[model samples]
Target: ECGSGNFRCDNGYCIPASWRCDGTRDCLDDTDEIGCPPRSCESGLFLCPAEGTCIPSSWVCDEDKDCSDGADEQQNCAKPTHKPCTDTEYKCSNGNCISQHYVCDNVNDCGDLSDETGCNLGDNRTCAENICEQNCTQLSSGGFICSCRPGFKPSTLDKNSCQDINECEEFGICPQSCRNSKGSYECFCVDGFKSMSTHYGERCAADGSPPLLLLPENVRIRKYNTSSEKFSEYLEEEEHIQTIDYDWDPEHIGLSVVYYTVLAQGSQFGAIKRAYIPNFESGSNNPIREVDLGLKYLMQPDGLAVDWVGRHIYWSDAKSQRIEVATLDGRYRKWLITTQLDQPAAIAVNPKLGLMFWTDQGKQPKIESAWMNGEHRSVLVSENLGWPNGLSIDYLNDDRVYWSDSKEDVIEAIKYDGTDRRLIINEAMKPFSLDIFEDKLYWVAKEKGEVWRQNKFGKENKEKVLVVNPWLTQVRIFHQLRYNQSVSNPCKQVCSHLCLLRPGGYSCACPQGSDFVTGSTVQCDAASELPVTMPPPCRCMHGGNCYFDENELPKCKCSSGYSGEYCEVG
Candidate 1:
């Protein structure tokens, strides 16, 4: 079987001696290219001038840069080698080749503008013409297409016509309700739900999710044991924990918990040392792990919340003047809110709503919320607020946001829209964190060094002293209520702090972190993060709220009725 004149390659292939060094890959192993002198490529095959290889014929003038030298596409031809079009196929001014069926379609299959020209809804010569009552455009091939207007989708039964699309029928188009409009549908969220269309979704399942229930005991995190009906340690270690929050991590046990305190008793090295107590005995004892966060010196790391679905942990660092986030395992850390958070005190997240809320202790204290991606920043409750601290979400009732003001010495509640502002507790000494469960509000007084409880509406029958310690900062509850029963409204007036309605009467009270200023039942005061300052006088008159802007000079925020450089013109 061996031919004497042929040469053999080590790969066990035999080729003619003349074909061995022909510069083309003749042997199956391409052994000819290794040892022979280079030769011109054979006829019918285009030699890629860049790499010296004879490529197939079809690649020539194919619009693709197949050869590194651009030789294949650059090859000149009197008549281009592109395949010819059939009688039915429509040829575009550009060299794009396409099928006949696309000719009159409303879409331009060809990128060049020529395919869409001379298009109209009515035509006789064309096989099919656009009969759309609305939009009609040219197709790449021959005919035209009917395009439905926005807010309306093409009807499946008759593609030429359009029909209104009920957005409600589309799941998740709205968090709860999708009301169809003429050209568009509107997404509306219910009482306990909120809109996340800005950053996350069309609508968010903001209501009916469990609330964070835990207490920040001096050196330990505690939750009420339903079986025992007493406070017990959720986590106990030597360092004092400033704040704590929990999330569900499927990889581990029932709850993934994170907490932080100071670097030490002193103030300088406070980079917000955060730690993880994963699998919090829900399934296993995942040993307590900690991290000296990538965050800068945290004068104090205060408020925190977790994104259960995305596996992210967020916290507010007061000294760092930023809100930061990290992975559940204490990795991939970065500053999430740098511009808004000025001495951010506490943070709360409604994962179902895809929203985050925080309290900022600035010259004008305010509660702000945004989508989880740190977008759509809204100042929810800014007016008539002072040094707001410790935030929580009430799931049992209307999705109400609750917070304590240490400086204002009052606790308050408001709808996510910033309305329904109510003062829940009054005449308290420096109330810190807040916890609402089963209609009861619990918080610790930093001044009185006691944990207190009261009805959510601040009912007199609901008030009680729960615990006493030498020093107290924050406390939370674990149990949650499933449903809220409809009841008669009882509040006699618009309660500024909180309103509690019993069988016959209603009670209003202040929130934590306050010993009421010598005033009245409706007004109370507490220490604020900002030092108290006195303005000499208003340089100009108008119904304007005056303040010192960035330049350390007085600037008047003119009322709707007035306007001027300093309102002096008005």
Candidate 2:
């Protein structure tokens, strides 16, 4: 069977996918790899693996069972069973039926535990145990109680109905930046530290509270432990690193690419400095590339392209930019892109398609793409793109070419044949560069001082102010998730009347009950009178009510708190 869309690597094999991984969703449902399956069991009783199997329940603990993962169709097979505990009493969750003893607690136990066969079973059917059945489900440890199934909840919500017991809130539950999600919860690790770097905590960065160092997300920080003390590439305190003397600081994409320079006091001899690792790696006492940039981009590297077989590498002059065909070891370096076409700034050549593309700083914006042999030079585009500075061409999709028109304060995209030329963004005072990846494009505007993005079709996808200092005259976007974790844009935050969160911890803000079948959100079930046989003398708070807790505790949730439809005044 063909794997899903994104999961299928360009190689054609369906593998799990991640933002950091090559963009490809192989699972047709687009959920084979979303951390948690978009759909989960009504009760934490079942689990679906990458193999797409829901292990049965009973054999969960049978050592010889094929369900080693122990998720078969079993029901309390390993737990100490007293009598058949039914959470089917309260159909809706919230403020009752939240007990282990099968009694009503202060919360909802069975999300949607109501019987669909109630009419046939007549009076034997329970209506209230349906909230978790339709809205949510309990978890593996605390016992699951779901409000809605996967795909049923919207994506805008990060925690959906699965609210985390966030110990981070006032009079909080935890200390580390830990928040309770719909079905589960997690702790966002600091910029320089990996999730639970040591795996000693429940979730990454989980100290049972809020986070210490906040940064972006999607970017991974590799931390390392060495003999001496340690550190990360993205140090918590990066305000002290030195910067390069280049006419421009690295653009917004990176205001500082490990900024630092070593200079000899006696002479103007300056050397390159070392940089830090983001997180989840060995901290650097200072591991930098000690080298100095020579006469005007003397060390400036340029050429970059995918090889015929699709290996990405940068070519260049005698420096790292020199074009070459050699082994991984610095061996044979050859000169490919000469300084013939005006003042060449940047380049991307796809040899597989025999195409070499680049941009130059001259009268009107000039872009070129020629045969690798340099014999068939194609003007591709020669529009007056406000002193067009940087140009990028994608061979797979030839209709568009991304170029930065510095003077015009905008980045644009034109057809390979130069048909539809339009400005993608003009907000940046001086957009000196651009780059493309997947559905989005990243660029830096020099004057406005920031990095921005847009879609491939020439429409601005979204813009972001990556920095305050717009130092670079030109820049290139590294359109990969390797940037930073904190950077992963949150699912557009907006206000809505009604909302439904999905299993991915994403919520969809909806118009009041728009997606739900019923008109009201507050669901209540008629409180049932149970047999108060235990501790014969001990009744309820008023020697009246008795409820069951998942922990098997007989707790009594009084009337005022039981707000099911029945005025449950229990």
Per TM-score, the best of the predicted structures is: 1
Give each model a TM-score: 0.43, 0.33
Which residue ranges in model 1 land beyond 4 Å of their true spot? 1-213, 226-234, 252-258, 263-268, 271-297, 479-570
Residue 380 miss distance in model 1 (angstroms) = 1.7
- Residue-by-residue lDDT tens digits, candidate 1, 456-520: 66645434455646545567553213222233345565544333222234444443334345666
- The C-alpha stretches of model 2 lying farther than 4 A from their native spots are 1-330, 363-365, 373-375, 394-399, 456-462, 472-570
The lDDT per prediction is 0.59, 0.39
lDDT of 2 by residue, 1-570 (tens): 444533453444565435323334445554444444255654544554535555555545565445444334233354354233255433332333334433223332345432111122123333345423444334323333333342233223432333234333322122224555664555454433335332222222222212111121112222222222232343333221122111111223222232232223243333333232222222232222222222122333333332222111223332332332211111122234454454555565543344556665544446776544334566766656566656666433442467776676677776656576676666556665566543346666666656565554554246573543533333333221212223222234441221122222223222211332255332212221232121211123222244555865534444455443222244
Candidate 1, position 47, lDDT: 78
**Cα RMSDs, all models:** 33.0, 44.0
